[PDB]
Design a protein around this motif. Structure first.
Motif, short mmCIF file in Angstrom:
data_model
loop_
_atom_site.label_atom_id
_atom_site.label_comp_id
_atom_site.label_asym_id
_atom_site.label_seq_id
_atom_site.Cartn_x
_atom_site.Cartn_y
_atom_site.Cartn_z
N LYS A 172 0.82 -1.20 0.00
CA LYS A 172 0.00 0.00 0.00
C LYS A 172 0.86 1.26 0.00
N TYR A 173 2.04 1.19 -0.62
CA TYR A 173 2.95 2.33 -0.64
C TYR A 173 2.36 3.50 -1.42
N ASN A 174 1.70 3.22 -2.54
CA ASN A 174 1.12 4.27 -3.37
C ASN A 174 -0.08 4.93 -2.71
N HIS A 175 -0.58 4.38 -1.61
CA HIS A 175 -1.73 4.94 -0.91
C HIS A 175 -1.38 5.46 0.48
N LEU A 176 -0.43 4.84 1.17
CA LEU A 176 -0.11 5.22 2.54
C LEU A 176 1.05 6.20 2.66
N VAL A 177 1.94 6.27 1.67
CA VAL A 177 3.14 7.09 1.73
C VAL A 177 3.22 8.05 0.55
N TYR A 178 3.13 7.53 -0.67
CA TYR A 178 3.34 8.36 -1.85
C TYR A 178 2.30 9.47 -1.96
N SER A 179 1.04 9.15 -1.69
CA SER A 179 -0.01 10.16 -1.82
C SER A 179 0.03 11.15 -0.66
N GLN A 180 0.30 10.67 0.55
CA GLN A 180 0.23 11.53 1.73
C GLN A 180 1.49 12.36 1.90
N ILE A 181 2.63 11.71 2.08
CA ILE A 181 3.89 12.43 2.27
C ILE A 181 4.30 13.09 0.96
N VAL A 240 11.17 9.64 7.63
CA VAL A 240 12.36 9.61 6.77
C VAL A 240 12.54 8.22 6.16
N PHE A 241 12.37 7.17 6.97
CA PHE A 241 12.49 5.82 6.44
C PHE A 241 11.44 5.54 5.38
N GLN A 242 10.21 6.00 5.60
CA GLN A 242 9.14 5.75 4.64
C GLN A 242 9.37 6.50 3.34
N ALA A 243 9.99 7.68 3.40
CA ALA A 243 10.27 8.44 2.19
C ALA A 243 11.20 7.67 1.26
N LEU A 244 12.44 7.45 1.69
CA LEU A 244 13.42 6.71 0.89
C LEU A 244 13.41 5.23 1.29
N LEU A 245 12.26 4.59 1.09
CA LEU A 245 12.06 3.24 1.59
C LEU A 245 13.06 2.21 1.06
N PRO A 246 13.30 2.09 -0.26
CA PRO A 246 14.18 1.01 -0.73
C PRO A 246 15.59 1.08 -0.17
N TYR A 247 16.11 2.29 0.06
CA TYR A 247 17.44 2.43 0.62
C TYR A 247 17.40 2.42 2.14
N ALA A 248 16.31 2.91 2.72
CA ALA A 248 16.17 2.89 4.17
C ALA A 248 16.17 1.47 4.70
N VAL A 249 15.48 0.56 4.02
CA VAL A 249 15.42 -0.81 4.51
C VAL A 249 16.79 -1.48 4.39
N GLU A 250 17.54 -1.19 3.33
CA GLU A 250 18.88 -1.76 3.19
C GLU A 250 19.82 -1.25 4.28
N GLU A 251 19.81 0.06 4.53
CA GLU A 251 20.64 0.61 5.59
C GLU A 251 20.22 0.08 6.95
N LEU A 252 18.92 -0.12 7.15
CA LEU A 252 18.44 -0.71 8.40
C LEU A 252 18.93 -2.14 8.55
N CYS A 253 18.95 -2.90 7.46
CA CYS A 253 19.47 -4.26 7.52
C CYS A 253 20.94 -4.26 7.92
N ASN A 254 21.72 -3.36 7.33
CA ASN A 254 23.14 -3.27 7.69
C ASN A 254 23.31 -2.87 9.16
N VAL A 255 22.51 -1.92 9.63
CA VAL A 255 22.60 -1.48 11.02
C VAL A 255 22.25 -2.61 11.97
N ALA A 256 21.19 -3.36 11.66
CA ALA A 256 20.80 -4.48 12.51
C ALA A 256 21.87 -5.55 12.56
#
Lengths: 701, 237, 117
Positions: free
Chosen positions: A32-41, C67-83
């Motif tokens: 739900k990224y296109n609905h929970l994050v992309y649209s809102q933030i 911040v994590f939700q914004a740059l999600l694909p890279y945030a999850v990778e950096e989080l994996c490395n941190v963990a």
């Protein structure tokens, strides 16, 4: 301060759990990224399907090593625990080396060199599977970091899985309160009741510290090499860490339709099978690591928590709810049993009066008064609860209730084991309906008031009260004898001579019910008398008879008791509660335990004698209590705290009842205060006089 | 008595006419060598290697060493397995905390402890037919609670692993002169071939690889930390 | 301010016209996400996840989650490395001993501890 390794390990494991929980939440946000994050933030990163799949592959590859580590440790420790349990079953309890011995209590009571030598010898013996007749040496209390890591990875698996998401009759299927997650239930007919459901055979097994295996039978698992060559479908037997480390390592497009699936081991992994596979480890983790490892969000130890967590949460919620309303209501109660019943239902209806319907009523305190008898507080309320329970639970005729708006037989009877009661319907007049509503009301009141109402009920009555679904196994708590007869009939129907036996018995779809319910012949189905019972529909006949004997006979009584309990307790708190929990919360422990009394007991003194005499008197009193019987036990508990049953745990008793010693006197009987539940005992100089005075005091009713 | 046991084991090891005898002899020898390794490790851990008087050999330790030398191609494998068993918890971070204990300085005091640990009886059959205190009664044996520290247990297990690895190294160093030193003097010795020695070395290296990687990783990490600290001290205020 | 920073990072990440800009944006986002993960873990560890009032997110933790939700694909990778970095000493048996500490029941205490860091 302490500066210990284990504290740092646990803290780092907690940090890892936090990061893994964040990763799980982020991973579950993708569908739900296109609905929970992309649209809102306002600022968001475009996400496709292929990059999401590669991202999942990356996360799994990064998490593989910790997964292997945790699997190794958990498999090894579960194998050790299971071998200990098997050895306890196959061992001699009299030997010091038995697990179920006082010497293994770990609290009441070798050298450090001997302990390390035992640990090393256990490791070396376990490496090549030579650990027989010696209990494994392990310390589960030192595996807190493993518990944190296991919690994090189980949270990850559960989150992604939730992102993904006899005759076969649900009546005969074991319910959630029956079975264990990840383990199949024992066959209802193959195993005798003495082992399938030991709680029905011995109701006295329900205690605050009880393992569900003993109460509801021992479960098996469909594992091991039989039709299984994956790596985790093989049941864990080996104890040493080397083998359980080789095993998990030697086996080697719209974005809204991601459907992430967890394959850590090359096979789809369901959290339920993991919980079933590590049952003993999780039980020990929940019993030991609950203050720290049971506080983080999404804790499986909380979800799989026993009676302690549920009772603490329910009592805290009841305290919060009863303190949210300033309306205080009380009752006037006298001893005279007929007058007691009349005044009680009248004052309860008045308590219901001045309000129409809908929202339940909440009270702060109960202040029971007595005519010509002094006393006020919680003690008199507890006395009222016990007296009304006993009066309602007396096998004798009942006074008329013709003035309820201004049915003779006793309400409750013992169908099976003595001490357990179920409603008996009469003419279904509105007076009996109101009386059942009133009994539901005061059961609710005792629930909120943290006071033990003493009406003992059958377990399916508790189900219908709480709103669950009755299974056939609950019928086992009705009465063992004819339940066993039904099970034997089901077993015989599987034999090749089933038709001839069924014809010889000449059974039809009718039930001959005696006067405890109304008596006479009742047809299970329309025109059921002319329809005989055949082995083709033996399951249907058994279902109808077993459910009919306890469910439909009393639709109106139980169904009215439902609103009786609901009108005081809102439905929010009845959830997350089972029948055993309710029985232990309202009725308390069935039998009074000497150890339970010792757990919460404090002694004072007013005679002023030397400490030696006071200690000797305390020892004499404890010896008296030990050498003193069950009926006299309930008599003494009544004389102490105005109740015959102790609450479920230490918390629940308001004053923590204590005992004071008065100046010596051979002519004064011991006294007690129910408002503070304090027992004043004279310092008797002789043993026999003390025994006589104590028995006379507890004989008073 | 030990000589007779070793002689019979060797005789059944080098028997070819009887079918299936060599495999059974090998399994029996493996079991006996595991037991000997257990008693040897316990005795060595109980003791402290004092440099005074250069004794270097207690009476039971010499007996265990004689057993290992007599059956070296299998004794080395059993010792490798024992060392792995002792070292796995230390390098997997699950060591059970234990209180510190003193080390025996005499052979007459190390006999005790070993006696109470080995001379024990099995659990008899059933006749006829911290939050630790919050654990269930049936599991009370699985939960504990002068120090009770993880580091002490880790150090002691590492010490045991060191003893076993030293014994393995001594045995493998005895291979080149097996005939002159081991075969002729000892009445009951096992014939050794060059390919057997090569296979033995390969087996030992393969078994020692994991702990080697563990120590190399940890030591490189800590050495880098210390070198960086020294460099920053040289470049700092 | 955080929204502006994330907008700049995202806009530079999605750049094809200027050559050699996506890689620089990737590196900058990587470093920023590593810093945000560090501060997020420090604040989360310094706190206690109390079930009362069901807050579950203070203001700083919410900012880190955003911040994590914004740059999600890279945030999850950096989080994996941190963990993995956090867990390596635990699963290698080389953790450095520390003394027990009480978890803050409120957020001002967490701020003081983080500020000294």
């Amino acid at each position: 301060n302490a500066s210990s390794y284990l504290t740092s390990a646990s803290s780092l494991a907690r940090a890892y759990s936090i990061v893994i929980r964040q990763i799980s939440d982020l991973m579950g946000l993708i569908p739900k990224y296109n609905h929970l994050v992309y649209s809102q933030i306002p600022a968001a990163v475009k996400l496709t399907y292929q990059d999401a799949v590669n991202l999942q592959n990356y996360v799994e590859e990064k998490l593989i090593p910790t997964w292997n580590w945790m699997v190794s440790i958990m498999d090894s420790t579960e194998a050790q625990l299971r071998y200990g349990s098997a050895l306890a079953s196959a061992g001699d309890p009299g030997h010091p080396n038995h697990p179920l011995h006082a010497s293994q209590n770990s609290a009441r009571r070798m050298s450090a060199r001997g302990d390390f030598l035992n640990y090393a010898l256990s490791l070396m013996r376990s490496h090549n599977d030579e650990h027989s007749d010696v209990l494994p040496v392990l310390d589960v209390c030192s595996l807190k970091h493993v518990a944190y890591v296991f919690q994090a990875l189980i949270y990850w698996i559960k989150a992604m899985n939730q992102q993904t998401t006899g005759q076969n009759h649900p009546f005969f299927r074991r319910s959630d309160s029956m079975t264990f997650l990840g383990c199949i239930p024992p066959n209802p007919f193959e195993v005798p009741l003495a082992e399938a459901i030991p709680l029905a055979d011995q109701p006295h097994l329900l205690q605050p510290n009880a393992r569900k295996e003993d109460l509801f039978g021992r479960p098996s698992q469909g594992l091991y090499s039989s039709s299984a060559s994956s790596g985790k479908c093989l049941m864990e037997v080996t104890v040493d860490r080397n083998c359980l480390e080789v095993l998990p390592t030697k086996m080697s497009p719209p974005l809204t339709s991601f459907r992430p699936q967890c394959s850590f081991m090359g096979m789809v992994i369901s959290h339920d099978m993991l919980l079933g596979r590590w049952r003993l480890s999780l039980e020990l983790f929940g019993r030991v690591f609950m203050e720290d490892v049971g506080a983080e969000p999404g804790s499986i130890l909380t979800e799989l928590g026993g009676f302690e967590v549920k009772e603490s949460k329910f009592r805290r919620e009841m305290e919060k709810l009863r303190n949210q309303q300033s309306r205080d209501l009380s009752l006037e109660v006298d001893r005279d049993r007929d007058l007691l019943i009349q005044q009680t239902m009248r004052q309860l209806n008045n308590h219901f009066g001045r309000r129409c319907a809908t929202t339940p009523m909440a009270v702060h305190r109960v202040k029971v008064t007595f005519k010509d008898e002094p006393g006020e507080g919680s003690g008199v309320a507890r006395s009222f609860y016990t007296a009304i329970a006993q009066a309602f639970l007396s096998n004798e005729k009942l006074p008329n209730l013709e003035c309820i708006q201004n049915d003779n037989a006793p309400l409750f009877y013992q169908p099976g084991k003595r001490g357990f009661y179920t409603p008996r319907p009469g003419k279904n007049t509105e007076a009996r309906l109101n009386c059942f509503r009133n009994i539901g009301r005061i059961l609710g009141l005792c629930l909120l008031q943290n006071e033990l109402c003493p009406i003992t009920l059958n377990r399916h009555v508790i189900k219908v009260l709480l709103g669950r679904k009755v299974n056939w196994h609950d019928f086992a708590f009705f009465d063992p004898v004819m339940y066993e007869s039904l099970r034997q009939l089901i077993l015989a129907s599987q034999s090749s001579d089933a038709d001839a036996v069924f014809s010889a018995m000449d059974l039809a779809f009718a039930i001959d019910l005696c006067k405890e319910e109304g008596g006479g012949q009742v047809e299970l189905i329309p025109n059921g008398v002319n329809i005989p019972v055949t082995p083709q529909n033996v399951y249907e006949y058994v279902r109808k008879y077993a459910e009919h004997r306890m469910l439909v006979v009393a639709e109106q009584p139980l169904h009215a008791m439902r609103k009786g309990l609901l009108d005081v307790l809102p439905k929010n708190s009845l959830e997350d509660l089972t029948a055993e929990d309710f029985r232990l919360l309202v009725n308390g422990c069935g039998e009074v335990n000497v150890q339970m009394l010792i757990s919460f007991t404090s002694f004072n003194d007013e005679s002023g004698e030397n400490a030696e005499k006071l200690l000797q008197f305390k020892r004499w009193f404890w010896s008296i209590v030990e050498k003193m019987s069950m009926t006299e036990r309930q008599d003494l508990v009544y004389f102490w705290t105005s109740s015959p049953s102790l609450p479920a745990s230490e918390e629940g008793f308001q004053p923590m009842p204590s005992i004071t010693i008065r100046p010596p006197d051979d002519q004064h009987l011991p006294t007690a205060n129910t408002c503070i539940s304090r027992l004043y005992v004279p310092l008797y100089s002789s043993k026999q006089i003390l025994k006589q005075k104590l028995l006379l005091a507890i004989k008073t009713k | 008595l030990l000589d007779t046991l070793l002689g019979t084991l060797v005789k059944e090891l080098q028997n070819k006419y009887t079918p299936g005898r060599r495999e059974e002899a090998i399994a029996v020898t493996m079991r006996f060598l595991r037991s000997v390794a257990r008693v040897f490790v316990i005795l060595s851990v109980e003791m402290a290697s004092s440099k005074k008087k250069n004794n270097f050999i207690p009476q039971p330790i010499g007996k265990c060493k004689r057993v290992f030398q007599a059956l070296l191609p299998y004794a080395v494998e059993e010792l490798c397995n024992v060392a792995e068993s002792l070292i796995v918890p230390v390098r997997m971070g699950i060591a059970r905390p234990t209180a510190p204990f003193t080390l025996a300085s005499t052979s007459i005091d190390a006999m005790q402890g070993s006696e109470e640990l080995f001379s024990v009886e099995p659990l008899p059959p059933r006749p006829s037919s911290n939050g630790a205190a919050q654990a269930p009664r049936s599991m009370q044996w699985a939960v504990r609670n002068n120090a009770s520290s993880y580091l002490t247990s880790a150090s002691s297990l590492a010490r045991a692993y060191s003893i076993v690895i030293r014994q393995i190294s001594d045995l493998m160093g005895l291979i080149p002169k097996y005939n002159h030193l081991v075969y002729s003097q000892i009445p009951a010795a096992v014939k050794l071939t060059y390919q057997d020695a090569v296979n033995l070395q390969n087996y030992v290296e393969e078994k020692l690889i994991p702990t080697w990687n563990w120590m190399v990783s940890i030591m490189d990490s800590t050495e880098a930390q210390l070198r960086y600290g020294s460099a920053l001290a040289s470049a700092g205020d």
